[PDB]
Amino acid sequence: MRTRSTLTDKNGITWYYEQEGSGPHVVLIPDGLGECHMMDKPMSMIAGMGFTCTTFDMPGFSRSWDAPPETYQDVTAQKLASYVISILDELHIDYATFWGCSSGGATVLALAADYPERMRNGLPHEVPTAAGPHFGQLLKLAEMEDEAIVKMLGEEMPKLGFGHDFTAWHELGEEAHARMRKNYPRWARGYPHTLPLSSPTGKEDLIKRPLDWTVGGDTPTRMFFDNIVTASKAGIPIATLPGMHFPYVSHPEVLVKHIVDTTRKYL
Amino acid sequence: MRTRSTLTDKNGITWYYEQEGSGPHVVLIPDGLGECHMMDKPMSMIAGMGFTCTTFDMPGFSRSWDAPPETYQDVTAQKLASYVISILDELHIDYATFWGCSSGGATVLALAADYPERMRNGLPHEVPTAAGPHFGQLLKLAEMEDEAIVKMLGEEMPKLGFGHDFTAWHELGEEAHARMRKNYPRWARGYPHTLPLSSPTGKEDLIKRPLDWTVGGDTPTRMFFDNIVTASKAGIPIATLPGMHFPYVSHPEVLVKHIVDTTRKYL
Amino acid sequence: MRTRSTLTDKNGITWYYEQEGSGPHVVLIPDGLGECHMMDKPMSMIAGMGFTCTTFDMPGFSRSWDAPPETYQDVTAQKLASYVISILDELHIDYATFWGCSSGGATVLALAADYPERMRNGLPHEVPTAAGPHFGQLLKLAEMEDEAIVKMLGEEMPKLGFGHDFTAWHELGEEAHARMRKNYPRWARGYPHTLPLSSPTGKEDLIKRPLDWTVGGDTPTRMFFDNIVTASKAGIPIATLPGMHFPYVSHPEVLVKHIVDTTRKYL
Amino acid sequence: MRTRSTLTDKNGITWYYEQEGSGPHVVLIPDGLGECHMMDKPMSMIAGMGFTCTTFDMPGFSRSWDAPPETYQDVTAQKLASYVISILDELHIDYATFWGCSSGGATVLALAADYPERMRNGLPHEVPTAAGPHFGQLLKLAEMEDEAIVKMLGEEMPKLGFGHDFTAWHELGEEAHARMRKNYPRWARGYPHTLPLSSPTGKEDLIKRPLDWTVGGDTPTRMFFDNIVTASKAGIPIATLPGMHFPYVSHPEVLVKHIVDTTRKYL
């Protein structure tokens, strides 16, 4: 069923990746934490609908930890899109539906803007576009702390702040949380400062390929208000889905329903 | 300071009203509960900025409870707008800034659509427009229950669902909560089933007068998402202010700052 | 089934009281708030088991608030016991089971100590014996504040501090909370400073009559730890029943089961 | 500094142990999870008071998991006491103060009952003595589930149920939580069926050595009510300390103050 492997890109990234199913390609880009096990529960549900689903740990994170520092420092949506294109090319994928949340969502936008020939349709979720607007207060200062306390402020927050199902978030498992531990400071040093102003949100870029922009049902309106305003002004289908920042974690069944339903409209 | 009185208008409504300050007129329309004491803390702060602030209990609610049944049964935004115009005329207010949340917001829009000559600028907050767009549990069924259980289901829900400031929600005082208890079943019989369909949200009505549409910063996105989409597509300035459904209760200082700042742009 | 009245005893207290049922007498003494509507749901369930249940508002509180200041200032367990004896005499009760929580529980203990001829068996719940028993807020300080802020510190804390069944706490209804609001400053001025030192907890006094001492199952252990230690060292049957400080509000059915079961062992 | 090593005892247990400081011996036995990193913050604070502190992971758990199945199946307080005696002998500790919570507390009691010559004074906390003196699901059924879901109900419950300082509980770190993951199913299969009944709580056993029995300040009264009743009836010093089930995690400083003060009274 699920297959796992490791492979290297000309960039020097040693990716860990997972695939399951057959049919049209769906690519699940993780959020900033870069832990693809968050997709573990949804993927089977997606693949069962007649799709081959692919995911991977992000460069420098979890089992993709063997990567050059430039791939997880000063990170931009454009660089992440290039990395996704690389791993995706190496996996002999031609053209695909892309899901992404947070920085991954930014990546999705960068994929729509700059590689439209490779996208059937895009699904971004809660894209950060402002300095500080991802959880609550400025993450952009967390880099000043020592690693242990960075991981401790981060793993102490994710449950109530956005991943608001303690049994599911914790159902990710202990090996995954141990990897996320080491992911937190790398994310804080490379993902908060640089990602927000790089999400391509211009009308023409958002319109190049079919785009379904979503927001967490229980997320406070102010966090990703700008997403809604931008999408609706650009004419992008914008909607809410159950959960907050990790709909695939807190509500895997509704996440797969949304993924499949949207993908089916653009086959 | 605060002046209070009771007066009858031609509809047969014996209004209770409050006024404070001097200067341009600001009218604070209550939410569906119709209890104007929720504005008690904000009003002084607004009036201190050089404004005459007027509020009142809604027909059939609290100290305006002595009113004909049609004024609080099968309630529509149009009926509420006519009642507000009546009380505004008798207080001989010519033209005013109007604030309204929920049904009051629906009233404000109805005031923009059908009485634009009387409105200087409008402020609606969290306008109900759908049978499902509400952070409760299908209000439109509550009318089937007994009065006591309607009021107790009511008073248990808005404190965390609609205010999220328990000490502030509760500082309203017990005479006010005593009125609100008796308001709850009347609200359930007359405000959930008829009011959502009646808010005029067409572009043409929304553009007649200056309009600042707001949503609670801490409201989860799905509750009034439609408000955001509609306002942004129509070109209406839309933003978030601290609080949820009762910003004047949970966050009075920022509520008055918002009211004053917006009103000052349109004198 | 319920009968209500008012009557005056020799102290000058104008009591409000309620009675229901027939059979052996059970008297439910309120907690410090002195609001007998907290027993509204339990009483019927007790009365249906073949008992006439009597309750009343405490002197100076709710509908018994027309009372001399001496009856609700510098309050002691002994004074409360004498008042309860007076009201019971006027109601032509000779002999009865007594329930009491907090100061009422203190009253029960004093009734066991000084009026053993009048009680068949006693039930006290979470009797305060120390200064500022509650962990977080020092009740012994509330008297320094003004009435509004006292009532707001009170009505705002009891719900999660004392009941943790919010839907039950307010189904008490509007009038009950309206009375309790005004009860708070009187309780704060008269009940935290003097009641804890007056509970008769000597071995011989606790043994004069059958005594079942209870603590809320969900109460933090330290709040009424002393109750457990004292009762168990004296050989008094001590157990917990569902709820915290207001078991008759949060858990009426198990409260009535406990009252009936214990009373049934001593007719 | 803290010293770390591994060693083998006659039972076939590959123990991981930690030691710090000099002076009289204080031994900190883990709760059922058997993870001694929970003592990481307290130990230094104890050592600074002039004590050599020793702790270890319990057989079959965390870094002591390489152990024969009999040491973590059908676990009794007596077996755990014998294992603890083995590890203390191997570290050539003669006589010491022992702290223990939950099963570790049961062990402490078993050490007082059956090895009193080795105990300076004993400190047990929240000893399980019944199959049902908690709130929710019967722990004795958890073994019927698959390991992943066993770990998932455990890690999802204790943070708010037993160890309630989420920032501290999570401050344990991810390597520790990764070990605790694999600890959960072994605990469920070997610790809840058999342990509650093996704690020696008879008066004669409890009096053999100085014993201070404690309960969590914020623990609900019903969880370890039996502990309070038993200790008070036997004449054992019984008191509350800040926290719930993991005081050394949630409130390390006061845990260390308690350990040191009690130990110093019996040096």
SS (H, E, C) A83-115: HHHHHHHHCCCCCEEEEEECHHHHHHHHHHHHC
Q: How far is CA C25 from CA A178, B211, C32, C81, D143, in A?
A: 63, 66, 22, 17, 50
Choosing from D37, D125, D193, D245, which is the catalytic residue?
D245
Instruction: Please give the DSSP secondary-structure letter assigned to residue B102.
Output: T
Q: Residue A134: which domain range? A: 1-267
Instruction: Please give the DSSP secondary-structure letter assigned to residue C159.
Output: I
H or E segment to which residue A154 belongs:
helix A147-156
Cα gap D20→D256, rounded to integer Å: 14
Interface contact flag, C240 D219, Cβ < 8 Å:
no
Cα gap D24→D41, rounded to integer Å: 19
Radius of gyration from C-alpha coordinates of chain C: 17
Q: Is C233 on the interface with B (CB under 8 A)?
A: no
CB C101 within 8 A of CB C192: no
Cα gap C37→C175, rounded to integer Å: 9
Q: Is the dihedral of CA D102, D104, D107, D109 positive or negative?
A: negative
Give the nearest partner residue to D155 out of A170, A180, A181, using CB atoms. Answer: A170
Which of D224, D19, D62 is CA-nearest to residue D28? D19
φ and ψ at A78, to 5 degrees?
-65, -45
Which of D124, D117, D47 is CA-nearest to residue D89? D117
Write out the two tokens for A215.
Answer: 């927001």
CB B13 within 8 A of CB B64: yes
Place of tokens 């604030």: B99
Q: Which residues contact D218 (CB under 8 A, 6 or more apart)?
A: C220, C221, C222, D164, D242, D243, D244
Give the amino acid at B222.
Answer: R
Number of Cβ within 10 Å of residue A224's Cβ equals 28
How many domains, chain B?
Answer: 1
Would you call D124 helix, strand, or coil by DSSP?
Answer: strand
Q: What proportions of chain D, in percent to the nearest 5, are helix, strand and coil?
A: 45, 15, 35
Terminal-to-terminal C-alpha distance of chain A? 23
CB A122 within 8 A of CB A209: yes
Give the amino acid at D244.
Answer: M
Instruction: Please give the DSSP secondary-structure letter assigned to residue B92.
Output: T
Which of C198, C210, C265 is CA-nearest to residue C235? C210
Terminal-to-terminal C-alpha distance of chain B? 23
Q: Is the dihedral of CA C69, C74, C75, C77 positive or negative?
A: negative
Q: Is the dihedral of CA C120, C126, C132, C138 positive or negative?
A: negative
Number of Cβ within 10 Å of residue A235's Cβ equals 12
Would you call B111 helix, strand, or coil by DSSP?
Answer: helix
Quote the distance between the C-alpha of residue B249 and its chain's center.
Answer: 12
What letters, b where the CB count within 10 A reaches 16 and e where it falls short, cover B49-63? bebbbbbbbbbbbbb
SS (H, E, C) A192-225: CCCCHHHCCCCHHHHCCCCECEEEECCCECCCCH
Give the amino acid at B52.
Answer: T
Write out the two tokens for C120.
Answer: 């068949």
Cα gap D135→D118, rounded to integer Å: 36
Cα gap D70→D76, rounded to integer Å: 11
Write out the two tokens for D186.
Answer: 């072994």
Place of tokens 């608030």: C65
Cα gap D64→D245, rounded to integer Å: 22
Q: How far is CA C19 from CA A23, C66, C250, in A?
A: 75, 20, 22
Q: Which residues contact C222 (CB under 8 A, 6 or more apart)?
A: C135, D215, D217, D218, D240
Write out the two tokens for A40.
Answer: 């573990």
- What dihedral angle (degrees, nearest 10) is formed by the CA atoms of A81, A86, A88, A93? 120
φ and ψ at C127, to 5 degrees?
-80, 125
Cα gap D2→D44, rounded to integer Å: 8
- Touch test A–C: 3 Cβ pairs or more under 8 Å: no
Strand A14-20 with A3-8, pairing:
antiparallel
CB B204 within 8 A of CB B116: no
Q: How far is CA C45 from CA C171, C251, D40, in A?
A: 17, 12, 53
Q: How far is CA D137 from CA B132, C8, D157, D226, in A?
A: 35, 52, 11, 19
The three-point CA angle D89-D93-D97 to 5° equals 120
CB A125 within 8 A of CB A214: yes
Interface contact flag, B225 A219, Cβ < 8 Å:
no
φ and ψ at B56, to 5 degrees?
-165, 155
Q: Is the dihedral of CA D151, D156, D157, D158 positive or negative?
A: positive
| B·C CB contacts under 8 A | 47
Assess whether A177 carries a catalytic annotation.
no
Which of D94, D99, D96, D86 is CA-nearest to residue D43? D99
Cα gap D20→D46, rounded to integer Å: 9
φ and ψ at D69, to 5 degrees?
-55, -30
Write out the two tokens for D206.
Answer: 């409890």
CB contacts under 8 A, C 166-205 vs B, are 166-167, 170-171, 173-175, 177-178, 180-182
H or E segment to which residue D258 belongs:
helix D252-264
Query: Per DSSP, what are the bridge partners of residue B4?
Result: B18
Cα gap C21→C47, rounded to integer Å: 5
Choosing from A62, A64, A82, A102, which is the catalytic residue?
A102
Place of tokens 């209760």: B249
Write out the two tokens for D4.
Answer: 């770390």
Q: Is the dihedral of CA C124, C128, C130, C135 positive or negative?
A: positive
Q: How far is CA B225 from CA B35, B102, B238, in A?
A: 26, 14, 11
Number of Cβ within 10 Å of residue C235's Cβ equals 12
C-alpha atoms less than 13 angstroms from C-alpha of A129 in its C-beta half-sphere: 21
φ and ψ at C157, to 5 degrees?
-95, -55
